Design a protein around this nucleic acid. Structure first.
Lengths: 27, 55, 117, 133
RNA sequence: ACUUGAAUUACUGGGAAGUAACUAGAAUAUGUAGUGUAGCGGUGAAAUGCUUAGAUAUUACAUGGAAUACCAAUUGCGAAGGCAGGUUACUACCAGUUUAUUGACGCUGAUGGACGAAAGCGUGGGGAGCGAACAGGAUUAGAUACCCUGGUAGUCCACGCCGUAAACGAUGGAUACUAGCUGUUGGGCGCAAGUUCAGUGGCUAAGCGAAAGUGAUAAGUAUCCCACCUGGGGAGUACGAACGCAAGUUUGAAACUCAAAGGAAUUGACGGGGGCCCGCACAAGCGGUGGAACAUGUGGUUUAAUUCGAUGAUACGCGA
């Protein structure tokens, strides 16, 4: 199919990953 | 090895064509880079399919 | 200091960016070397038949006036110049008796370095 | 996609009945004036009578004929005929830099066989450098 | 009660099917020794880098690590992940057929158990090449990237931990029917032709499908069981719980907002996709403009007014 539908699911899973990475070592 | 006994241009052309025939002028340009199995296994299913549709 | 008995070899090691010719005694002791980059060909023209011919002829009539008459040329590596590196030695005195090619090929030995984009 | 060429046939001159003199005066012409160009050429070749005839001029025209030109800056032969148009063009172009009095006077460069051979020497020196192509 | 389903046994075979232990060569790297002098390496071109403290190159020997060119492939095996130099030991599985044997002992399967690419985590070794992060050189207006030179973790081994992939045939497991043509793998019957089971590809009829397509190894016609779906975003998010050393995995909402998201195919348009052609389009040659002074046109600034319009190619010595 088209790639636009699979798109934005890379951004939604990258922003959460980067947020969880930047919120580590917080305690 | 490619030992070849022995004019000089005739023997040189014979050696050059034997070197081109033994499949090495393109064998090293394939080893200069790294081809992982995930990409080396599709150039077979895309070549066999072409040879089959060319029959 | 090295013996120059009249039986020797010429190792022509070429690659994708240069070529090196080495006329050597029959025991591994190098007599006279030459390179395309040595013969004032710095640039993208090191891998060219003319550069290979000039590099070969540079050492041809240098090792000639030493006592070398018969050569057993060993060719190694890909790249242009393997033709006009033996052409302009056999056409410049010293006579060739073999065109043995000893290009090394690994049997899946090491990992090639990171295919370039 | 020009698909053709005609070479533009020529006709000889009365004096010297030669076909190269016509090409020379044709390259010498300015603003479509052939009579004054012929006059200037005749005065020049008569001034050259100091030291033979136009034979020495046509042999000096040979020293300005290049055998290879650079045009990755690859060298190549030009043509069996464009040699005697590059030679004439170079001679006429470098004879207009001489700080003499008249055109027939500053055209006395055929005996300089002098800004004409320098061009051929520079062309050969620039073509022998890029010989690996 | 029976053998057709199923399972066991006997004979022929089949494989990169697993676990463990030995062993071989090519190649790369390093070290020692011999020869020898000004380069080597790299790029679209360069530079960083190694080099007269002897590099690159060549010969001989030694050390160490990882992977196995040719065979080699729409091959074969495995439930899947996956499995490739050679040898042995310990196992497992599958196919065909003259057997003999039990007699429905079968299919699926929520909770659940086991296995499960790569990356990642803990402990102890190893570390040749490659190389996240990182350090320099280069390109660029900038380049925390592509390119070049180095390089740590890692990649490897012995015990473990998580349980995630485009884990794909984007097609759950069984059984039974329904046209052919054409290869190939391992068996049986064949003196050959050829025939019959068990797997693996391609073309296509009917039939299905919105179409692309599928098509006897169905996405064809039926029956059984399991899982999943109910507009897009919010959202695999919030809260609670379980597991894990951690990274994280599994389960999983709502408030709010829009009238749309989406699949197949068609015509055009475009591409720093391909192929074939044309034009003073480019390549060659000549003469110019942009430099100077003058004439008109226009923009801009002033004036009581500086009449109006075109202000890319297709306006600016134009209407005039």
């Amino acid at each position: 199919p088209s790639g636009k539908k699979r798109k934005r699911h890379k951004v939604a899973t990258h922003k959460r990953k980067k947020r969880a990475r930047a919120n580590r070592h917080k305690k | 090895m490619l030992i070849i006994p022995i004019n000089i241009d005739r023997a040189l052309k014979r050696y050059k064509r034997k070197f081109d025939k033994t499949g090495t002028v393109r064998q090293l340009r394939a080893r200069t880079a790294f081809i992982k199995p995930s990409v080396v296994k599709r150039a077979q299913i895309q070549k066999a399919a072409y040879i089959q549709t060319l029959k | 200091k090295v013996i120059v008995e009249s039986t020797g070899e010429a190792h022509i090691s070429s690659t994708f960016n240069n070529i090196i010719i080495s006329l050597t005694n029959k025991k591994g002791e190098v007599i006279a070397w030459s390179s395309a980059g040595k013969m004032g060909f710095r640039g993208s023209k090191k891998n060219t038949p003319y550069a290979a011919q000039m590099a070969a002829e540079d050492c041809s009539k240098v090792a000639l006036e030493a006592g070398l008459k018969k050569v057993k040329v060993y060719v190694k590596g890909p790249g242009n110049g393997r033709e006009s590196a033996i052409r302009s030695i056999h056409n410049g005195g010293i006579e060739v008796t073999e065109i043995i090619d000893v290009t090394p090929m690994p049997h899946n030995g090491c990992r090639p370095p990171k295919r370039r984009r | 996609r020009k698909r053709a060429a005609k070479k533009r046939p020529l006709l000889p001159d009365p004096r010297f009945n030669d076909q190269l003199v016509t090409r020379f005066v044709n390259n010498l012409m300015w603003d479509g004036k052939k009579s004054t160009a012929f006059k200037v050429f005749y005065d020049a070749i008569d001034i050259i009578e100091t030291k033979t005839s136009l034979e020495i001029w046509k042999d000096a025209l040979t020293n300005v004929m290049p055998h290879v030109e650079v045009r990755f800056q690859i060298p190549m032969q030009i043509r069996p005929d464009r040699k005697i148009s590059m030679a004439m063009k170079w001679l006429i172009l470098y004879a207009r830099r001489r700080n003499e009095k008249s055109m027939a006077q500053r055209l006395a460069s055929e005996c300089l066989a002098g800004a004409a051979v320098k061009k051929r020497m520079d062309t050969h020196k620039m073509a022998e450098a890029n010989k690996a192509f």
